[model samples]
Target chain A: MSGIPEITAYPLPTAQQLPANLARWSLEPRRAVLLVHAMQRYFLRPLPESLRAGLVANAARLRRWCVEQGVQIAYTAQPGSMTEEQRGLLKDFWGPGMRASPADREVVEELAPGPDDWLLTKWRYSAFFHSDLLQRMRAAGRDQLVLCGVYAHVGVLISTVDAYSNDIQPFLVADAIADFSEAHHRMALEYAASRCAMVVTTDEVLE
Target chain B: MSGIPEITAYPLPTAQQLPANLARWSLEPRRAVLLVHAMQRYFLRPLPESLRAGLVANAARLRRWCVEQGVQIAYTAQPGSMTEEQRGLLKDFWGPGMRASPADREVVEELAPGPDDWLLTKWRYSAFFHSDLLQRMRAAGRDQLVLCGVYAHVGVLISTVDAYSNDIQPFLVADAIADFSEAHHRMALEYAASRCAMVVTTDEVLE
Candidate 1:
């Protein structure tokens, strides 16, 4: 709060704090819910073998959380294959498939979604890009969106920004989203809080 | 370099190290180009007054460098004039727009773009988001994109990623792109270099 804005001062109310206008929109239950899980290539590949155990464990927790919330969970995985130039760009920093793990292609055990829930495969940062997500959301009459996923700064941040541009109301789950680096994660949270979305923790959502 | 991957071992080649397949796609023209600047509301809103001077100064230096390169310059002003939501978010972090004078939109006099070269308005993070950027680029055949802007981890970083997604070969001017914090800036550079684009300094481009 020293130099940054207070979260309470957010202009747009989150789902929990929806103003009358947005609350009316949120009242409709038919709105298909989208829980975006940022599964990057690194999570699948070249992630330290040591981190895998914790990730798998977290995946299970996330699955359980999904079940408890009755929210359909979906994963956004970066494609492993790339043009050589693309691959070169991704090499050293992310390593091979750094954004996702090879195993990430397989759904994490904890929150295995039913077939009714959509599973969107994306190659870029925004889940809505080149994916059936928007179509699916429209079919489900889901104009209100709640986002939680990996790399708060990169995936969730970018998606939320795009969601605003696309005219969707975006609610960011503060605690649920994370990043590979702690600094990036915090930055992402701060960034989301400053935009069209309101930042709430997972517990607040579930409670 | 300690925990991070080496440049040579990067998955992608540097601008100086293009693979054969990308040889035809290399668009780095010899002409000096303009650099348009924009910031993520997240980064801009949260800055303290003491720190803001440095950021604005950085912007000034970047603009001067662009001018020195004979590049045109562009930036988004009217930060307060943004929608109530955007304004609210920025205000929450940085006091009212009227209170934070330095952070308010003002270009460094040394590098102020001439009338013909300046693009004064933009709403989206991408300079091309709503502006005549693509048309300008197309008209100028400015195929090679040398990006230097704010919050490398946020605006500049995300822009580069999206640019790559759209098939534009982007060169991130490492020294030119600044973030609220150095750590964030470095992370963006590493991510850009590894996953979607090449990393070069302004000197590299100018030389």
Candidate 2:
């Protein structure tokens, strides 16, 4: 009742299945930051091997492209062994989250963040919640956030809306994220495309 | 591409169809605030007469019951004639929103707010964004928010998540809210019940 449930392996959404974005903005390396959200071991533990691999591979591709293009790199990780007060209402839906150990909290080695990468300590579903991500984006003069991460319907989508609210354009990388199921993953993409973020694929962003 | 679409009349979800809530918290008059969100004429203009009347009727019923039980009342209304800067990224997805005229921005007379009711000027989908709602809740010693409003999957659901993140228990009044479609309405209820808020019907809250 407390931890994430085991996820069934589903094929990642292809470019054809991706929804058309509402925002007309295009991604630019100088104006964009790539946010790798909740890729820590504890959160990714619930995904089946194939699904996890697929997500990581696509995210890594985006990371490499962004690095090559001089886009700011950032990552969000939740601290392990959070106190009841710190965990807050999150504990109600998801009981006592990841522990304080490296195995439970470390970002996956596949996409290990660089020393200059902005490490945001995420406390809630939206990466912007009680986090300096907004200020960092502002300080860096970045107006667009390209999001690639896990649980597409939850953190990624919430953060997209948060970014939109703060006047930061968001790009949701469809195949780079994984979810509890195909339905939830598709739901997140459709919602983002219809409401806030521009939904794109890894290849689309790279191009 | 701008403004809300014309909505067809769809019956609100019945008690039998309401999703089961994940949170175990019960409604307490003294500790709760009933949030009437975006019920203004501008936002509700798109709903067909029957659907609009049903939503307003149910929300009014909840308001009357909450008033009788001494539950704090709060309403969120977006100002009309927002400047481009004030509108921010919202203008991208939804072009220049509600006009400045009272005919467009006023809350429907069916559920006029009381003099002492908290009037929160909402700037974003989540009522908590750029608003003093959280501080006001803290000041009033309230930790539970009962939400009922339009566009169930967007503003209401986002506000429910924001409330949950702040450790405030949120109850989404299912039957009292309307959406773009029945599917969207049900999706909001399902997401709220599965993740953050308790999804309840008007009758259940009244009793």
Candidate 3:
């Protein structure tokens, strides 16, 4: 289906516009894992200049901070040319996704994952599906997930809900994620704040 | 935090208002399981009479059709008076949900599950979380879940996403579900249709 749409540019949400975080869980670097979710070139290519560059810059800043603080990092990247069985119902909605070429699957260079980062093969929207993320977090004694990435209403949002369902606190970095449109992006933040996670901005988490 | 709001009366979405379903999967009665999600008294008590009665009537009609077709049935009902440990992060958003009493926890009489129905003790927004619904479906060779229930944007939406992720096709029955408001209800249907499931009306499903 080539479900990724041609995304338009909109000013990224400022801190004041974020919905009040019902969970209001604080971000602790020592106990946190920065989740750089679905930041592949295939996913980010549709974004307009304003959103694409802004999202990458903010996410990059956060990733740098995570490294400085010794916070663990994880990234979710769907395998290019997934099998029919591996894609399952996803193929129904989003035809065959990104191709096998590095051009299609590689994470954007600005926020490329480091050697220590855990690369999870994204099978579905939720990062935890078939991934050892929960077990790894539990093993590392990290209960908080600080999320930043593309398509705020889809993968990023579902990952937050999955994190909360697994009893891991999720903090969504509002400005660090882009979406199909500003409406979708804003709805993602509102849903996350109201239902599962705290909605933090890049600045809020940086502090 | 007593998260359930005072929901006002708004007509449930008619067949015309449903978003275009991307999956467009056929609902096979032999492979289908009708999910009566969170129809508990505590959850339904807040909806205005118009919406409440309408949701129940449509859902009941759908449930009856499933029975006539020899389809399986599953219901998700969260336990009342959950311990802090049991409740976990849910308590942070919805503080100490419904107490242990029939008024708070029982499924409404109109859609009550029969002895043969599967009753899943929902621990989170997703019915699949910590439940055997997926395994049971797999064991029985059932693949499709037709969902109709309360708070369209919360439990029903998450459950649909979880179902799709696990390779089970989800059908969100639009008129058979209720939410905090028309906006929230519409958003849930739109998200489900666009991303995970087929959005169908009660009449469409019955036929």
**Candidate with the greatest DockQ versus the true structure:** 2
Q: List TM-score (chain A only) for every prediction.
A: 0.67, 0.98, 0.97
Candidate 1 chain A least-lDDT 10 residues: A1-10
lDDT of 2 at A157: 93
Looking at candidate 1 chain B, the ten consecutive residues that score lowest on lDDT are: B1-10
Poorest 10 consecutive residues by lDDT, candidate 2 chain A: A1-10
Error of 2 at B112 (Å): 0.9
Write model 1 residue lDDT over A1-207, tens digit each, in one string.
Answer: 011111211121235542222111231223435565654433423334444344444445544655565655556655655555665433423434432335545444444557766778765567776778777776666666677655566667777777655556666766555455554555565556654466665455455
* Candidate 3 clashes between residue pairs 3 or more apart in a chain or in different chains: A1-A95, B1-B95
Model 2 stretches astray by more than 4 angstroms:
none
Question: How big an interface RMSD has model 2?
Answer: 0.8
lDDT of candidate 3 over B1-207, digit per residue (tens): 588877889998888878887776999999989999999999998999999999999999999999999899999998899999998998888998988899899999999899999998888989999999999999999999999998899999999999989888899999999999999999999999899899999999987
Distance from true location, Cα of B132 in model 2, Å: 1.0
Q: What is the lDDT of residue B127 in candidate 1?
A: 58
lDDT of 2 by residue, A46-123 (tens): 899999999999999999999999999999999888999998888888988888899988999999999989999999
TM-scores for all predictions: 0.61, 0.98, 0.98
Better of 2 and 3 by lDDT: 2
Docking class of 2: high
Tens digits of per-residue lDDT for model 3, A2-53? 8787777899899889888877688888899999999998888888887899
The reply for model 3, stretches above 4 Å from the true place, is none
